[PDB]
Amino acid sequence: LSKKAKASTVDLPIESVSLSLQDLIGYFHPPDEHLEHEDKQNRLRALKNRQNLFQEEGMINLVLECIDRLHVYSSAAHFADVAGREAGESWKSILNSLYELLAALIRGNRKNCAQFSGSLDWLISRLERLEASSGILEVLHCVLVESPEALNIIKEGHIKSIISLLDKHGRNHKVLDVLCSLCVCHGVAVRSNQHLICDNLLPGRDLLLQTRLVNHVSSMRPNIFLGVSEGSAQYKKWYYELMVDHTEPFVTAEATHLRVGWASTEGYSPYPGGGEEWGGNGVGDDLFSYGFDGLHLWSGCIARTVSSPNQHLLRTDDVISCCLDLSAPSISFRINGQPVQGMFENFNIDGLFFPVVSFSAGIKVRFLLGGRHGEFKFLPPPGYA
């Protein structure tokens, strides 16, 4: 077929090959665990004898040749175009069965795994292909578990290809198991493979899941709901203050969280929108919230430094004045009477606004809302209520 003889003249025993590959896989099937010990040992001995006979007669290189000649066609459609429709549908099944037969032939036989070392380099060369990745990975695992010489012949290029399999094909625990088998075999650690795996996988922090302890953060708000709409009786300017009676910079190994500002609900519901109900999120992490920490303006989980007279993180005996203007969307802060040099502008005004403070453990702060709810330390800006 490669030499371009026409399809009908060439005889291609597709069905018989598949049936024989199924029978061969059943023939080399490993013993069941439920079997009694003597029977299990007898079947294991028979399987080992069969594997030895096949390897001595060279039954393994023939499978490799069949796999190589089937791999010249990129896809089942291409194989169907070259040979025929039935060959096209059977191309994937035969290719998977061949790899399964190879894995069954090499499994548990140290001599077979050792003789597969020469072909190991050719095996990893097709790992990127999607039609044979699982079978190639299984054969690689079977060789690596049993053959110390396999670890000796595995090089940096092969280790990097195995790692890039994670990047391209997504998360898979079998390739992780193969990488584990690379490090240690039969209680012997390969320091070079350990170093290569570490230096090629760990520093990226883009494939493996990452872990970290995060302080719990809760938010405290008043009852008032503030909004603007056409033909409605609400004052568009508002003002309130927060006083920090005490704050511990490091209650734990993680820095204490303390942010103040305004938050907006989603629609006309009373529930704050756009943020997780519990976790390490606070004021200024979503686009429905707007916060100040004493050094940065917080909005959408992204902070930018804003200048101020004697910039500092929120310390004890600090008075924060927050101003909300709904006539033109504008949120401005003033620390200890000194105006902060940044403001939030042109935000969504469809929902209702309300004061909010987010914090971790180790704070002591007070809302100064005016009136009989705490007199303001400083005079409100003109036009603000």
Partner: protein, 107 residues
């Protein structure tokens, strides 16, 4: 070079001097914002001696410009810490590091 932003002010007078050990708590941050080191996790203050090439230079001049009791943010360019090779396993090649450093005591 190294840019220093003050998080909390210090005394402003007792700067580290020549051949004096510096006791600091630091927290290592990559530029994207992922923590790779922190002495507060180990709960042991870090001590290093000025001018004897015990730590990265970016850290050395950061602490030298810093003052006693001053919590500051130290950002180190790739050339001033782990230039091209990087730290194997921890720091990727050509990385910018942000340090939150507090000068507890000069001793």
């Amino acid at each position: 070079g190294v840019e220093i932003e003050t998080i909390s002010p210090g005394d402003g007078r007792t700067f580290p001097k020549k051949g004096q050990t510096c006791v600091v708590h630091y927290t290592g941050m990559l530029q994207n914002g992922k923590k790779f080191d922190s002495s507060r996790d180990r709960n042991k203050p870090f001590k290093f001696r000025i001018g004897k090439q015990e730590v990265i230079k970016g850290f050395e001049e950061g602490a030298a410009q810093m003052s006693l009791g001053q919590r500051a943010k130290l950002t180190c360019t790739p050339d001033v810490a782990y230039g091209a090779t990087g730290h194997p396993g921890v720091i990727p090649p050509n990385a910018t590091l942000i340090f939150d450093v507090e000068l507890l005591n000069l001793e």
